[PDB]
mmCIF file of C-alpha atoms and ligand atoms in Angstrom:
data_model
loop_
_atom_site.group_PDB
_atom_site.id
_atom_site.type_symbol
_atom_site.label_atom_id
_atom_site.label_comp_id
_atom_site.label_asym_id
_atom_site.label_seq_id
_atom_site.Cartn_x
_atom_site.Cartn_y
_atom_site.Cartn_z
ATOM 1 C CA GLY A 200 -0.068 -0.049 -0.110
ATOM 2 C CA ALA A 201 0.865 3.651 -0.114
ATOM 3 C CA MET A 202 2.464 4.938 3.205
ATOM 4 C CA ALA A 203 -0.367 7.714 3.274
ATOM 5 C CA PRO A 204 -2.728 7.145 0.515
ATOM 6 C CA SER A 205 -3.860 10.118 -1.287
ATOM 7 C CA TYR A 206 -5.958 11.398 -4.221
ATOM 8 C CA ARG A 207 -4.448 13.941 -6.958
ATOM 9 C CA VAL A 208 -5.652 15.173 -10.140
ATOM 10 C CA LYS A 209 -3.297 15.947 -13.489
ATOM 11 C CA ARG A 210 -4.310 17.827 -16.576
ATOM 12 C CA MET A 211 -2.612 15.760 -19.052
ATOM 13 C CA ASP A 212 -2.598 12.384 -21.310
ATOM 14 C CA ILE A 213 -2.717 9.281 -19.182
ATOM 15 C CA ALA A 214 -0.284 7.492 -21.567
ATOM 16 C CA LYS A 215 2.435 9.672 -20.104
ATOM 17 C CA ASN A 216 1.139 8.413 -16.336
ATOM 18 C CA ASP A 217 3.539 8.082 -13.610
ATOM 19 C CA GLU A 218 1.626 5.413 -11.745
ATOM 20 C CA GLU A 219 2.156 1.688 -11.438
ATOM 21 C CA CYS A 220 -0.758 0.598 -13.470
ATOM 22 C CA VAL A 221 -3.418 2.281 -15.745
ATOM 23 C CA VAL A 222 -7.604 2.210 -16.129
ATOM 24 C CA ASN A 223 -8.487 2.187 -19.439
ATOM 25 C CA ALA A 224 -11.948 3.990 -20.345
ATOM 26 C CA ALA A 225 -12.505 0.715 -22.626
ATOM 27 C CA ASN A 226 -15.590 -0.480 -24.813
ATOM 28 C CA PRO A 227 -17.062 -3.615 -24.458
ATOM 29 C CA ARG A 228 -15.577 -5.164 -27.594
ATOM 30 C CA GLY A 229 -11.722 -4.655 -26.736
ATOM 31 C CA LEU A 230 -11.514 -2.268 -30.036
ATOM 32 C CA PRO A 231 -8.941 0.695 -30.464
ATOM 33 C CA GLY A 232 -11.840 3.316 -29.926
ATOM 34 C CA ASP A 233 -11.251 6.876 -29.455
ATOM 35 C CA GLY A 234 -10.107 9.518 -26.910
ATOM 36 C CA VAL A 235 -8.406 8.154 -23.707
ATOM 37 C CA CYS A 236 -9.266 4.136 -24.855
ATOM 38 C CA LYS A 237 -6.977 4.944 -28.889
ATOM 39 C CA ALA A 238 -4.373 6.831 -26.242
ATOM 40 C CA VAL A 239 -4.289 3.529 -24.297
ATOM 41 C CA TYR A 240 -4.133 1.304 -27.530
ATOM 42 C CA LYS A 241 -1.156 3.265 -28.724
ATOM 43 C CA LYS A 242 0.686 3.152 -25.864
ATOM 44 C CA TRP A 243 -0.025 -0.497 -24.684
ATOM 45 C CA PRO A 244 -1.481 -2.457 -27.934
ATOM 46 C CA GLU A 245 -0.633 -5.776 -26.347
ATOM 47 C CA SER A 246 -3.060 -5.159 -23.535
ATOM 48 C CA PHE A 247 -5.918 -5.356 -26.051
ATOM 49 C CA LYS A 248 -5.304 -9.322 -26.300
ATOM 50 C CA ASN A 249 -8.692 -10.605 -25.184
ATOM 51 C CA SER A 250 -9.911 -7.239 -23.310
ATOM 52 C CA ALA A 251 -13.663 -7.556 -24.355
ATOM 53 C CA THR A 252 -15.547 -7.254 -21.464
ATOM 54 C CA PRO A 253 -19.081 -6.421 -20.546
ATOM 55 C CA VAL A 254 -20.797 -3.094 -19.228
ATOM 56 C CA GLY A 255 -20.046 -2.770 -15.485
ATOM 57 C CA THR A 256 -16.987 -4.648 -15.390
ATOM 58 C CA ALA A 257 -13.037 -4.705 -15.486
ATOM 59 C CA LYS A 258 -10.762 -6.889 -17.070
ATOM 60 C CA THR A 259 -6.989 -6.647 -16.709
ATOM 61 C CA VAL A 260 -4.423 -7.540 -19.464
ATOM 62 C CA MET A 261 -0.372 -7.432 -19.131
ATOM 63 C CA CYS A 262 1.730 -4.930 -21.200
ATOM 64 C CA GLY A 263 5.191 -6.663 -20.666
ATOM 65 C CA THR A 264 4.615 -6.644 -16.523
ATOM 66 C CA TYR A 265 2.304 -3.246 -16.617
ATOM 67 C CA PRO A 266 -1.296 -3.722 -16.129
ATOM 68 C CA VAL A 267 -3.927 -2.119 -17.986
ATOM 69 C CA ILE A 268 -7.250 -2.500 -16.276
ATOM 70 C CA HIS A 269 -9.859 -2.174 -18.818
ATOM 71 C CA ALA A 270 -12.810 -0.934 -17.208
ATOM 72 C CA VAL A 271 -16.319 -0.240 -19.588
ATOM 73 C CA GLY A 272 -18.634 2.351 -18.473
ATOM 74 C CA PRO A 273 -21.744 2.478 -19.584
ATOM 75 C CA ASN A 274 -23.093 4.716 -22.919
ATOM 76 C CA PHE A 275 -25.759 7.189 -21.203
ATOM 77 C CA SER A 276 -27.188 7.234 -25.132
ATOM 78 C CA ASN A 277 -28.176 3.419 -24.544
ATOM 79 C CA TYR A 278 -29.143 3.274 -20.879
ATOM 80 C CA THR A 279 -31.626 4.846 -19.014
ATOM 81 C CA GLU A 280 -30.099 7.445 -16.115
ATOM 82 C CA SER A 281 -31.260 4.701 -13.482
ATOM 83 C CA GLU A 282 -29.455 1.821 -15.103
ATOM 84 C CA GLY A 283 -26.581 3.751 -16.516
ATOM 85 C CA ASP A 284 -25.968 4.922 -12.713
ATOM 86 C CA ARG A 285 -26.019 1.677 -11.364
ATOM 87 C CA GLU A 286 -23.602 0.109 -14.118
ATOM 88 C CA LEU A 287 -21.106 3.170 -13.738
ATOM 89 C CA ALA A 288 -21.157 2.232 -9.673
ATOM 90 C CA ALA A 289 -20.338 -1.401 -10.498
ATOM 91 C CA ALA A 290 -17.398 -0.565 -13.162
ATOM 92 C CA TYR A 291 -15.441 1.436 -10.222
ATOM 93 C CA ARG A 292 -16.299 -1.113 -8.027
ATOM 94 C CA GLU A 293 -14.291 -3.779 -10.390
ATOM 95 C CA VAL A 294 -11.470 -1.397 -10.808
ATOM 96 C CA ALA A 295 -11.136 -1.408 -6.839
ATOM 97 C CA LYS A 296 -11.000 -5.126 -7.053
ATOM 98 C CA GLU A 297 -8.522 -5.413 -9.474
ATOM 99 C CA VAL A 298 -6.190 -2.741 -8.035
ATOM 100 C CA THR A 299 -6.457 -4.368 -4.689
ATOM 101 C CA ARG A 300 -5.763 -7.875 -6.549
ATOM 102 C CA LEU A 301 -2.762 -6.677 -8.081
ATOM 103 C CA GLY A 302 -0.956 -5.140 -5.096
ATOM 104 C CA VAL A 303 0.105 -2.076 -6.500
ATOM 105 C CA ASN A 304 0.683 1.329 -4.709
ATOM 106 C CA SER A 305 -0.662 3.561 -7.096
ATOM 107 C CA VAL A 306 -2.915 3.544 -10.034
ATOM 108 C CA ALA A 307 -3.620 6.539 -12.908
ATOM 109 C CA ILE A 308 -7.731 6.866 -13.599
ATOM 110 C CA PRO A 309 -9.897 8.514 -15.990
ATOM 111 C CA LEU A 310 -13.325 9.589 -15.479
ATOM 112 C CA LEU A 311 -15.471 7.097 -16.749
ATOM 113 C CA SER A 312 -18.537 7.702 -18.850
ATOM 114 C CA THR A 313 -17.674 11.455 -18.943
ATOM 115 C CA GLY A 314 -16.612 11.953 -22.910
ATOM 116 C CA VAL A 315 -18.273 10.386 -25.510
ATOM 117 C CA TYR A 316 -20.507 7.753 -23.105
ATOM 118 C CA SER A 317 -21.787 10.822 -21.541
ATOM 119 C CA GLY A 318 -25.058 11.011 -23.267
ATOM 120 C CA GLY A 319 -24.035 14.651 -23.935
ATOM 121 C CA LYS A 320 -24.289 15.415 -20.059
ATOM 122 C CA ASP A 321 -21.778 16.740 -17.754
ATOM 123 C CA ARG A 322 -20.995 13.950 -15.315
ATOM 124 C CA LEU A 323 -17.934 15.256 -13.575
ATOM 125 C CA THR A 324 -19.538 15.138 -10.227
ATOM 126 C CA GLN A 325 -21.335 11.899 -10.597
ATOM 127 C CA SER A 326 -18.621 9.850 -11.979
ATOM 128 C CA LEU A 327 -15.855 11.132 -9.414
ATOM 129 C CA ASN A 328 -18.443 10.449 -6.577
ATOM 130 C CA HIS A 329 -18.696 6.847 -7.446
ATOM 131 C CA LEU A 330 -14.759 6.797 -8.237
ATOM 132 C CA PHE A 331 -14.398 7.816 -4.598
ATOM 133 C CA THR A 332 -17.173 5.224 -3.423
ATOM 134 C CA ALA A 333 -15.192 2.262 -4.758
ATOM 135 C CA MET A 334 -11.335 3.275 -4.263
ATOM 136 C CA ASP A 335 -11.917 5.112 -0.524
ATOM 137 C CA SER A 336 -11.185 1.715 0.887
ATOM 138 C CA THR A 337 -8.019 1.035 -1.153
ATOM 139 C CA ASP A 338 -4.579 1.975 -0.024
ATOM 140 C CA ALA A 339 -3.278 2.772 -3.544
ATOM 141 C CA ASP A 340 -2.349 6.251 -4.248
ATOM 142 C CA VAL A 341 -4.864 7.343 -7.136
ATOM 143 C CA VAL A 342 -4.025 10.178 -9.709
ATOM 144 C CA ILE A 343 -7.187 11.075 -11.849
ATOM 145 C CA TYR A 344 -6.243 12.151 -15.320
ATOM 146 C CA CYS A 345 -8.144 14.603 -17.115
ATOM 147 C CA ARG A 346 -8.271 17.367 -20.154
ATOM 148 C CA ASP A 347 -10.490 20.216 -19.690
ATOM 149 C CA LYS A 348 -8.717 23.279 -17.539
ATOM 150 C CA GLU A 349 -12.351 23.862 -15.688
ATOM 151 C CA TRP A 350 -12.255 20.268 -14.821
ATOM 152 C CA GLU A 351 -8.978 20.164 -13.149
ATOM 153 C CA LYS A 352 -10.099 23.026 -11.116
ATOM 154 C CA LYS A 353 -13.573 20.853 -10.055
ATOM 155 C CA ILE A 354 -11.974 17.813 -9.763
ATOM 156 C CA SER A 355 -9.217 19.414 -7.001
ATOM 157 C CA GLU A 356 -11.773 21.337 -5.254
ATOM 158 C CA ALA A 357 -13.435 18.098 -4.810
ATOM 159 C CA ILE A 358 -10.604 16.100 -3.675
ATOM 160 C CA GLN A 359 -9.749 19.154 -0.999
ATOM 161 C CA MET A 360 -13.080 19.574 0.162
ATOM 162 C CA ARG A 361 -12.745 16.015 2.248
ATOM 163 C CA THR A 362 -9.157 16.632 3.317
HETATM 164 C C1 LIG B 265 -1.757 19.137 -26.493
HETATM 165 N N1 LIG B 265 -1.436 17.561 -26.672
HETATM 166 C C2 LIG B 265 -0.695 16.824 -27.481
HETATM 167 C C3 LIG B 265 -2.902 17.114 -26.588
HETATM 168 O O1 LIG B 265 -3.872 17.653 -26.126
HETATM 169 C C4 LIG B 265 -2.605 15.509 -25.997
HETATM 170 N N2 LIG B 265 -3.440 15.386 -24.956
HETATM 171 N N3 LIG B 265 -4.133 14.044 -24.984
HETATM 172 C C5 LIG B 265 -4.875 14.150 -23.610
HETATM 173 C C6 LIG B 265 -4.504 15.158 -22.848
HETATM 174 C C7 LIG B 265 -4.969 15.630 -21.758
HETATM 175 C C8 LIG B 265 -4.523 16.645 -21.378
HETATM 176 C C9 LIG B 265 -3.774 17.566 -21.950
HETATM 177 C C10 LIG B 265 -3.169 16.972 -23.073
HETATM 178 C C11 LIG B 265 -3.686 15.618 -23.758
HETATM 179 CL CL1 LIG B 266 -16.350 8.256 -22.113
HETATM 180 CL CL1 LIG B 267 -11.833 16.778 -18.904
#
């Protein structure tokens, strides 16, 4: 575990992370995809061997010895708000199980279902709160990776408000 488990946020490409493993915002079919998923495919293409997994699950595939945790958030274009919210919570619970199983001291994680799976809604708070619900009982250092400068400030504020 980390000596003093923390949350941090950085505004940069998660393919350049400084953590012991990465969470991919994957699609259910193990396809290269776009956004975080395409960056992850470029950096760790070997981790897409048999990475297909259903919505609300996570499946880990090693790229060398570096673990890529493929976490499949719901696409809110297809799910109801209620069912989508349940599957988004479940994907992060499966990430916490994998992070624990791997024995890593740190993990790089994007906000699931906030980009092309958001169904055109701002889900920063919904996705981040489900991330915290899952990860709070883990002792890994968590580093959240984002793109938007306003999102960086809001995630940083949310982390600080609990400390
Ligand atoms: C400037 N460049 C090369 C990019 O926009 C690449 N990139 N990809 C993800 C990401 C997150 C924050 C900042 C830059 C990011
Ligand atoms: Cl997304
Ligand atoms: Cl963002």
